[PDB]
Design a protein around this nucleic acid. Structure first.
Lengths: 275, 55, 165, 55, 55, 55
DNA sequence: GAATAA
DNA sequence: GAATAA
DNA sequence: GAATAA
DNA sequence: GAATAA
DNA sequence: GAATAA
DNA sequence: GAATAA
């Protein structure tokens, strides 16, 4: 939902692909995120085996190749990632309290579980955008900034704005003397919440503790539409700003709505009442 | 080896059986009504005047 | 006019699905009058604005509580809804008009697909929901608009124009 | 003569548009539940004993 | 199998609802562990599972 | 070339629904700079081809 | 019946 | 038009 | 001419 | 694209 | 979808 | 199996 594809959670994660990107965001009037493919690779599934005699515990980590990392999808429930800092978003240290892929009652998670030597690859098509438009050229240094989507749910505190709704109506400045009523329609993308969690297994004391050695692999297709050969500040017409959260809030909850329901334009069939 | 016997049993694929919020119920509101149109009156809606259907 | 004699019925059907791109109208109990059938009709009073849902291109903000919002935003096809009336023949008698009173049974039935809730709370699901074209205002009396027709205009260039160009 | 013009108009046959009480809605009660079966305990339902599914 | 019952319908009426239906033996169902004698009594197994029951 | 779509045969002030005002500049400015933007760039909804990295 | 004949 | 679009 | 040669 | 869309 | 849409 | 049996 956010953009960690630049790998913000540590500034140590920059590769020329990020650098190539920055130089393109300089020479570009606008951009599209065309496709985003994520591939998790699980090298190990390792629980901490807790051997407890009364009033003592022996700890050892042990490989479980009969267990696997659960990649959860929240497709039944409205949920949000809290975001504060570029570090606050990390595939590891990022969490929400009282959250479990396993509820004793209604398990709202569609899970995809990967064992050792199996990978979870998932691709998102980030081109939501129709009618010869683009997203503004952007260096992704800014967190609380969201992947291309028409998702309709914004907080009152940090409104994402028209770019976030399906039908975009916005005003780009073009300096003081001019304006652009950049105005497009785009297809709606529900982006659920995604999680990497362990099996919940009650041990004698609470849960078993699993820690997964993995390699996430996240690669992001972008067509950087580079600048004209001649200045056109008036070219922002077909550029849109990203669905970045705007506000003073230090912490910002980036929305995840699981699904876009299908409704019909079709009339009925097999309705008994004759009309 | 991980193996076991069972009936209507399968290797476990993705299962989340809640719909992603797509479901449609269809009723027809049905409101037959016998009514009268009275233009014979002087009172309010009873007059020479066209009586309206506010669809 | 469409005139019905005794033992003849006037049946007319309206297709109230005006709505495109995977949207819906809010769930509504119709107890509220000054509330209008689905339409993209463009004419609203200044006193009781119907709002974006009423114009063809909808741009609206649904609350989703305080912390969130939804810029529900759709396009929909325009429906002119004329005014409909049940009246008598006007026949001058010696004194003013003849007075007719019709025994009739109106029969009004309305197809609706009620898209029921998710199996899990999504206050953020109002994205594809729209509020009805209900009139909003303090006005005790409210005039609900009827515009007879949506004129057809062409994207076609001319033909049989004498000037050569 | 009894005659009149109209559209989607017809000689009036039997119409009662209420169903004779025949209508069927279908939901599936869906109750996925993650659970534990603990035989490691001495307490009540945690024992060597078979745990029951009361369909 | 053959149902003969009286439903009230209030005080003034009754319904001798009366049907035939096919017989269903429903056995008992259980979730248990292997019984394995250890040096001390049985081994203790506890299963992490997700029941999924839809109706 | 202009198609002047002439008025209804009956007043419809509510007919402006499908009318738009021109892109006239509005303001007090005596001098007004009418914008000319040379080109509308073509961008693709197409994914790539002949990209060496395998994915 | 490039000069407007639907 | 396993995530209910009759 | 999974390691980007349009 | 009887309610005028050359 | 001579004005760079791989 | 105009009176709604997907």
């Amino acid at each position: 939902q956010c953009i960690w594809w630049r790998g913000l959670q540590n500034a140590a994660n920059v590769n020329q692909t990020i650098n190539n990107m920055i130089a393109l965001n300089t020479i570009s009037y606008g951009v599209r995120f065309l496709k985003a493919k994520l591939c998790i690779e699980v090298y190990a599934v390792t629980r901490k085996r807790l051997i407890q005699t009364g009033a003592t515990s022996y700890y050892t980590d042990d490989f479980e190749q009969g267990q696997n990392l659960f990649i959860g999808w929240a497709d039944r429930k409205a949920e949000s990632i809290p975001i504060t800092t570029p570090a606050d978003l990390d595939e590891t240290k990022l969490t929400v309290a009282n959250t479990t892929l396993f509820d004793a009652n209604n398990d709202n998670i569609t899970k995809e579980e990967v064992p050792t030597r199996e990978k979870w690859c998932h691709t998102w098509d980030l081109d939501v955008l129709n009618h010869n438009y683009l997203w503004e050229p952007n260096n992704l240094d800014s967190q609380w900034t969201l992947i291309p989507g028409a998702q309709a749910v914004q907080p009152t505190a940090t409104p994402i704005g028209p770019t976030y709704q399906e039908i975009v109506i916005a005003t780009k400045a073009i300096g003081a003397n001019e304006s652009a009523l950049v105005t497009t329609i785009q297809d709606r993308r529900s982006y659920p919440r995604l999680m990497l969690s362990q099996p919940q297994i009650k041990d004698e004391t609470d849960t078993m503790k699993f820690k997964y050695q993995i390699r996430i692999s996240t690669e992001l297709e972008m067509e950087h539409h580079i600048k004209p050969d001649i200045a056109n500040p008036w070219l922002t017409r077909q550029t849109l700003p990203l669905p970045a959260l705007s506000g003073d809030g230090t912490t910002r909850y980036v929305p995840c709505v699981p699904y876009e329901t299908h409704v019909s334009q079709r009339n009925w069939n097999h309705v008994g009442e004759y009309l | 080896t991980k193996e076991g016997y069972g009936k209507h049993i399968t290797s476990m694929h993705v299962r989340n059986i809640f719909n992603q919020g797509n479901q449609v119920i269809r009723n027809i509101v049905k409101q037959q009504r016998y009514e009268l149109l009275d233009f014979t009156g002087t009172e309010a809606g009873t007059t020479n005047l066209p009586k309206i259907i506010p669809y």
